[PDB]
C-alpha cells in the first residue's frame, strides 16, 4: 500500500502551470492526495512550492483547500524545513492568498500558517531573510483590516524573531540593530493608535487586554537586543519617549470595567530598566509630569512608578526626577483635594524608597 506514496510523489513534482476548469480541477486533486503524509528526495516539495506560487487567484475554493493543505504538509517537521529556504521565501511575495475573497477571508490563515513556519525556521534563517520577513508581520499588527486575533500573535513571533535578528547580528555583520527598532516605531505606533481606539470601550475588553499584554513583552524584549547597558542614541531614545507617553494612555480602560495588571506593568516597568540610566533619566523628566498627571485618572499606573524605584538602579535616578517635579507642584497640594492626595501618595512612596535602600537615596 505504501507504493501509493511513491506513486503520488510523481505527480506532485510535475503539474506546473505552463482550459480554466481543467487546470483548476487538476491542481485541486493534487492538494487532496498531498494531505496524506501519515507515512512520515524533496521532489514532491519542489513541485508543491512551484504550484503554490502559481495557483490562480480567482480560484478561491482551490486556494482555500491549498492553504489548508499547505498547513498540513508543513507539519512534517523534517522536510518542512527545506521548503522555506528552497522556495527563496517566495511566499513572502505578493502571491500571498491572491484573490479578492481570499484576501478578506483567508488572510489570517495565510499569515498564521507562515507564522508557525517562521516560528521553527527562526533558528534556521539569516538576518537578510528576517528583514524581509518582519516586514509582512509589521504590517499585520498595525493593519486594521485583519482580525485582532492575528494581530496579537503577529507580535508573539516577533518577540522571538528579534532574538534571531540579534543572534544573526551577533554571529555576523548583520545590521540588526537598525532593523530592531524599525518595528519599535510600529510598536509605539500601535499604542498611539490603540489609545484612540479604546474609545469604543466607552468580549472587546478581552481582545484589548490580550492585545496590549502581547505588545509589552514585544517592546520589552527588543530592548534587550537593542542594548546588546550601553548608552542609547538620542534620536533612538526619542522613540521611547513617545512609547511612555502613548503607553500610559493605553493602560486605562482596565479599571472602569488585578494579577494581570501588576503582571503587565511590572513587565512594562522593566522596558526602561535595563537600558542605560543616563538615557533613562533623560526619558522620564520630559514625560514624568504627564505620567504623574496620567496616574491621577488611573492609580494603577503607580504600580509602574512604585515598582520603578523599588529596587534597581532606577531608584535613585527616578526619585530625583519625581520629587523635583512634586516640589514645584507643592503649592497645588492642599487646594485641589483630588490632586492633593496624589502628590502625597507619590511623596509617601518616594519616602518609602529612601527607607528601603538608604544607599545613595539618603544622599538623594
Amino acid at each position: 500500500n505504501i507504493h501509493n506514496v511513491v506513486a503520488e510523489f510523481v505527480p506532485l513534482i510535475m503539474n506546473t502551470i505552463a482550459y480554466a476548469d481543467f487546470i483548476a480541477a487538476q491542481i485541486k486533486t493534487l492538494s487532496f492526495l498531498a494531505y496524506i503524509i501519515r507515512i512520515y528526495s524533496q521532489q514532491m516539495v519542489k513541485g508543491m512550492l512551484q504550484l503554490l506560487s502559481n495557483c490562480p487567484a480567482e480560484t478561491a475554493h482551490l486556494r482555500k483547500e491549498l492553504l489548508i493543505a499547505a498547513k498540513h504538509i508543513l507539519t512534517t517537521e523534517l522536510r518542512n524545513q527545506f521548503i522555506p529556504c528552497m522556495d527563496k521565501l517566495f511566499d513572502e511575495s505578493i502571491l500571498i492568498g491572491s484573490g479578492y475573497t481570499a484576501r478578506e477571508t483567508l488572510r489570517p490563515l495565510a499569515y498564521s500558517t507562515l507564522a508557525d513556519l517562521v516560528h521553527h525556521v527562526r533558528q534556521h534563517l539569516p538576518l537578510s531573510d528576517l528583514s524581509l520577513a518582519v516586514q509582512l508581520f509589521a504590517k499585520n499588527i498595525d493593519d486594521e483590516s485583519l482580525p485582532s486575533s492575528i494581530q496579537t500573535m503577529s507580535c508573539k513571533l516577533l518577540l522571538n524573531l528579534v532574538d534571531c535578528i540579534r543572534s544573526k547580528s551577533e554571529q555576523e555583520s548583520g545590521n540588526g540593530r537598525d532593523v530592531l527598532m524599525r518595528m519599535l516605531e510600529v510598536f509605539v505606533l500601535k499604542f498611539h493608535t490603540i489609545a484612540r481606539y479604546q474609545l469604543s470601550a466607552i468580549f472587546q475588553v478581552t481582545d484589548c487586554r490580550s492585545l496590549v499584554k502581547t505588545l509589552v513583552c514585544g517592546v520589552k524584549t527588543i530592548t534587550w537586543g537593542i542594548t546588546s547597558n550601553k548608552q542609547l542614541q538620542p534620536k533612538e531614545t526619542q522613540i521611547y519617549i513617545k512609547l511612555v507617553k502613548y503607553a500610559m494612555q493605553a493602560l486605562d480602560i482596565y479599571q472602569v470595567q488585578m494579577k494581570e495588571e501588576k503582571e503587565v506593568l511590572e513587565h512594562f516597568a522593566g522596558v526602561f530598566t535595563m537600558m542605560n540610566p543616563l538615557t533613562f533619566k533623560e526619558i522620564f523628566q520630559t514625560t514624568v509630569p504627564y505620567m504623574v498627571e496620567r496616574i491621577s485618572k488611573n492609580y494603577a499606573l503607580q504600580i509602574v512608578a512604585n515598582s520603578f524605584l523599588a529596587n534597581p538602579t532606577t531608584s535613585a535616578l527616578f526619585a530625583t526626577i519625581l520629587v523635583e517635579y512634586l516640589l514645584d507642584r507643592l503649592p497645588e497640594m492642599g487646594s485641589n483635594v483630588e490632586l492633593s492626595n496624589l502628590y502625597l501618595k507619590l511623596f509617601k512612596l518616594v519616602f518609602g524608597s529612601v527607607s528601603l535602600f538608604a544607599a545613595e537615596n539618603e544622599q538623594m
Binding site: 477571508t105 505606533l189 493608535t193 538620542p234 526619542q238
Partner: protein
C-alpha cells in the same frame, strides 16, 4: 562687542558641561538667553552659538528637554531670515543630525514668525521636491507649517500640483520611511479647505498602493467630515473620472468614500444620476474583482435610498452561468437581485431564480453574502411564496432526496409536511449541529400552537 565676549564665554562654559558630564546647564542656558534679551546682536553670531549647541547636544547625547532649545529659539525667532538660510544650505541639509535640529525648532510655538518666512517662498520647496532624502525633508517642512497654519496652502497655486505630480509617481519608492503619512497630510488639508474633486481623486488613488502602512483612520476623517446635497455635485466629475491610466482599484476606493456620501440622505439630481449610472457598463467588463461587487451593490442602495430596465442588464451576466465568473461577485450579483426586488420588480419567473441561487452552491464565503442577501430577500419573496405555491419546500425536497440544509432551516425559522423534514434530517445529523436544533423546535411548537 559685548556679545562677542559672551559668545566666547558660552563656548568655554559649554565645553565645561560636557566635560563635567564625562549649574552648568543653568549657566549655559542663561547666557544663551542673554543673546535674545540684548538687541543689536549680529546675525552672524547665530552660526557660532548654533554649532556649539549642536556640538554639545550630540556630545551630551540629549535632544529632548535640553535646556538650550527654548532660550535659543527666542533669539532665532527675532532673526528668522538668516537662520532659515543657514539651515537651507545644501550641505547642512544632507546631514541628518543637522536636519533633525532644523525641524525641531519649526515645531515650537515661537517658530510662528520663523515659519512665516518659509511660507513666504513656496518656490523654495519646489526646488527640493522635484532625491528622496532631500525630498523627504521638503515634505516635513511643508507639513509642519500647515500643521499650525491650516489656511496656508489653501490658495489655488501650483505648489499642490508639484506635490501632486511627484505624489502619484513615487509610490514605488516605499516598496523616506515615514513619507507616505507625512505627504498625505499636506493634500488632505488642502482638500479639507477646498473640494479638490480630481485632486481628491489622486490622493485616494495612491492611498492604498506601494505597500504603505501609515494611514490608520487618518484619511477616513474627510469621508466622515465630507457629509457635514454635495454628492450630486461631487458625483458629476466622478463619472468623468479623467483616468487616463486608472484601474478598478482606483474606482473601488473611490466608491468607498461615496457610500458615506450617499448615506447622507436627495435632490432632483438623483433623477439624472440614474440615467447616467445605467450607461456605464459598456457591455463587456474585464474587471474580475470586487469592483463589480462594490459597484453592483452600490447601485441597488442608491436608487431605493435616493430606465430601470437598463439597470437589470447589470445582473444579466450573473443571471447566466459563464458570465459573472468569480463566485464572490456571483453571490453579490444575487444580492443585487434581492435589493432590486423591493418595489415593483417582483415577478414569479425571476423570483424562483434568485431563491435557489442563495441556497445553491453553499459555502462559508457564500454564507456571508447569501446571509446578507437572504435578509433583504426574506421579507420580499417568501411573502409571495407564503401566499404562492410554497416553492421553498421543492428545493428542500430536492437536496434531501439526493442524500447542508441549515440555511433553509434559518429561512424557515422566519416562515405542514416540512415539519417532518427538519425533524427527520436534524435527528440523523445530531447522532456542532446543536445550534439550529433548539431554535427551530421552539418555532415548531409555536407554529403548532398558533395553528
Amino acid at each position: 562687542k559685548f556679545c562677542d565676549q559672551m559668545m566666547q564665554h558660552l563656548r568655554k562654559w559649554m565645553e565645561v558641561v560636557v566635560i563635567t558630564h564625562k549649574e552648568e546647564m543653568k549657566i549655559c542656558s542663561a547666557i544663551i538667553n542673554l543673546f535674545h534679551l540684548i538687541p543689536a546682536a549680529p546675525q552672524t553670531l547665530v552660526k557660532p552659538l548654533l554649532e556649539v549647541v549642536m556640538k554639545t547636544e550630540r556630545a551630551m547625547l540629549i535632544e529632548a528637554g535640553s535646556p538650550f532649545r527654548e532660550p535659543l529659539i527666542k533669539f532665532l525667532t527675532r532673526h528668522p531670515s538668516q537662520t532659515v538660510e543657514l539651515f537651507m544650505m545644501e550641505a547642512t541639509l544632507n546631514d541628518p543630525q543637522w536636519s533633525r535640529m532644523f525641524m525641531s525648532f519649526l515645531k515650537h510655538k515661537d517658530a510662528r514668525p520663523l515659519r512665516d518666512v518659509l511660507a513666504a517662498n513656496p518656490n523654495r520647496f519646489i526646488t527640493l521636491l522635484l532625491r528622496l532624502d532631500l525630498q523627504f525633508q521638503a515634505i516635513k517642512i511643508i507639513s509642519i507649517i500647515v500643521k499650525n497654519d491650516d489656511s496656508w496652502l489653501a490658495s489655488q497655486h501650483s505648489l499642490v500640483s508639484q506635490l501632486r505630480r511627484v505624489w502619484v509617481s513615487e509610490n514605488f519608492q516605499e516598496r523616506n520611511w515615514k513619507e507616505p503619512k507625512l505627504l498625505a497630510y499636506c493634500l488632505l488639508n488642502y482638500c479639507k479647505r477646498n473640494y479638490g474633486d480630481i485632486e481628491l481623486l489622486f490622493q485616494l488613488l495612491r492611498a492604498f498602493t506601494g505597500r504603505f502602512l501609515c494611514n490608520m483612520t487618518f484619511l477616513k476623517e474627510y469621508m466622515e467630515e465630507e457629509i457635514p446635497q454635495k454628492r450630486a455635485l461631487f458625483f458629476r466629475f466622478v463619472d468623468f473620472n479623467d483616468p487616463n491610466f486608472g484601474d478598478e482599484l482606483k474606482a473601488k476606493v473611490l466608491q468607498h468614500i461615496l457610500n458615506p456620501a450617499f448615506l447622507y440622505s436627495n435632490p432632483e439630481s438623483i433623477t439624472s444620476v440614474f440615467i447616467t449610472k445605467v450607461l456605464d457598463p459598456e457591455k463587456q467588463a474585464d474587471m474580475l474583482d470586487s469592483l463589480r461587487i462594490y459597484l453592483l451593490q452600490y447601485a441597488t442602495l442608491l436608487v431605493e435610498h435616493a430606465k430601470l430596465r437598463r439597470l437589470m442588464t447589470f445582473a444579466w451576466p450573473c443571471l447566466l452561468s459563464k458570465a459573472c465568473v468569480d463566485p464572490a461577485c456571483k453571490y453579490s450579483g444575487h444580492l443585487l437581485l434581492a435589493h432590486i426586488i423591493a418595489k415593483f420588480a417582483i415577478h414569479k419567473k425571476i423570483v424562483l431564480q434568485v431563491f435557489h441561487s442563495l441556497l445553491k452552491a453553499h459555502a462559508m464565503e457564500a454564507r456571508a453574502i447569501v446571509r446578507q442577501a437572504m435578509a433583504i430577500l426574506t421579507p420580499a419573496v417568501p411573502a409571495r411564496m407564503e401566499d404562492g405555491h410554497q416553492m421553498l419546500t421543492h428545493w428542500t425536497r430536492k437536496i434531501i432526496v439526493e442524500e447542508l440544509v441549515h440555511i433553509l432551516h434559518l429561512i424557515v425559522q422566519h416562515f405542514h409536511h416540512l415539519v417532518q423534514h427538519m425533524v427527520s434530517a436534524m435527528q440523523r445529523l445530531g447522532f456542532e449541529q446543536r445550534r439550529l436544533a433548539v431554535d427551530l423546535s421552539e418555532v415548531v411548537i409555536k407554529w403548532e400552537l398558533q395553528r
